[PDB]
């Protein structure tokens, strides 16, 4: 149960990346670029 | 990792894993 | 931890704070020590760099963790106050060529 007021006033955003099994995790890089 | 260390068995969905191409040759010989 | 990826695919989550500029990463439910601080008015594109060792490489996920807005709210103005995650047709994967 998230706080609706906190959700409305917040500016944090989230996304996730799922690396499938069998793919080398060292070869995969996740983050942001400009 | 080894140092780090009714049942529901959940094995690795290993089908997605792929081998190096030499490894394909090695798998071929050991299958033969 | 190791071998926490073969039973289930690895979960790296990216958290961006547009008010403070703090970039924190959540991986498999534990917060990674790596963090980045950016300067105001910075356009950050979600991005993944990978070398394919399998037919399936990775998967963008647009969900939300507790007390965080989904990426669609930050991206699209009309969805600013919509907690429900969305993937409008405008959003699409691009590659460097």
Swiss-Prot record, chain A:
Function description: Cytosolic calcium-activated calcium channel that mediates the release of Ca(2+) from the sarcoplasmic reticulum into the cytosol and thereby plays a key role in triggering cardiac muscle contraction. Aberrant channel activation can lead to cardiac arrhythmia. In cardiac myocytes, calcium release is triggered by increased Ca(2+) cytosolic levels due to activation of the L-type calcium channel CACNA1C. The calcium channel activity is modulated by formation of heterotetramers with RYR3. Required for cellular calcium ion homeostasis. Required for embryonic heart development.
Tissues expressing the protein: Detected in heart muscle (at protein level). Heart muscle, brain (cerebellum and hippocampus) and placenta.
Name of the protein in its database record: Ryanodine receptor 2
Upregulation: By TGFB1.
Domain of life of the native organism: Eukaryota
Domain remark from Swiss-Prot or TrEMBL: The calcium release channel activity resides in the C-terminal region while the remaining part of the protein resides in the cytoplasm.
Modification after translation (UniProt): Channel activity is modulated by phosphorylation. Phosphorylation is increased in failing heart, leading to calcium leaks and increased cytoplasmic Ca(2+) levels.
Subcellular location(s) of the protein: Sarcoplasmic reticulum membrane
Disease in which the protein is involved: Ventricular tachycardia, catecholaminergic polymorphic, 1, with or without atrial dysfunction and/or dilated cardiomyopathy: An arrhythmogenic disorder characterized by stress-induced, bidirectional ventricular tachycardia that may degenerate into cardiac arrest and cause sudden death. Patients present with recurrent syncope, seizures, or sudden death after physical activity or emotional stress. CPVT1 inheritance is autosomal dominant.
Chain's gene name: RYR2
Source organism per UniProt: Homo sapiens (Human)
Annotated family: Belongs to the ryanodine receptor (TC 1.A.3.1) family. RYR2 subfamily.
Curated annotation (Swiss-Prot), chain B:
Subcellular location: Sarcoplasmic reticulum membrane
Superkingdom in the source lineage: Eukaryota
UniProt PTM: Channel activity is modulated by phosphorylation. Phosphorylation is increased in failing heart, leading to calcium leaks and increased cytoplasmic Ca(2+) levels.
Tissues of expression: Detected in heart muscle (at protein level). Heart muscle, brain (cerebellum and hippocampus) and placenta.
Comment, domains: The calcium release channel activity resides in the C-terminal region while the remaining part of the protein resides in the cytoplasm.
Family the entry assigns: Belongs to the ryanodine receptor (TC 1.A.3.1) family. RYR2 subfamily.
Name this protein carries in UniProt: Ryanodine receptor 2
Gene this protein is translated from: RYR2
Residues of the full protein shown: 2798 to 2846 of 4967
């Amino acid at each position: 149960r998230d706080d609706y007021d906190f959700l409305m006033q917040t500016s944090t955003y989230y996304y996730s990346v799922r690396i499938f099994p069998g793919q080398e995790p060292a070869n995969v890089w996740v983050g942001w670029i400009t | 990792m080894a140092l780090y260390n009714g049942y529901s068995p959940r094995a690795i969905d290993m089908s997605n894993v792929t081998l190096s191409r030499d490894l394909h040759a090695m798998a071929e010989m050991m299958a033969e | 931890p190791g071998q926490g990826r073969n039973n289930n695919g690895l979960e790296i989550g990216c958290v961006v704070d547009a008010a403070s500029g703090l970039l924190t990463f959540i991986a498999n439910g534990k917060e990674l020590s790596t963090y980045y601080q950016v300067e105001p008015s910075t356009k950050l594109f979600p991005a993944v760099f990978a070398q394919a060792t399998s037919p399936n490489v990775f998967q963008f996920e647009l969900g939300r963790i507790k007390n965080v807005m989904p990426l669609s709210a930050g991206l699209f103005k009309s969805e600013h106050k919509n907690p429900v995650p969305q993937c409008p047709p405008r959003l699409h994967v691009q590659f460097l060529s």
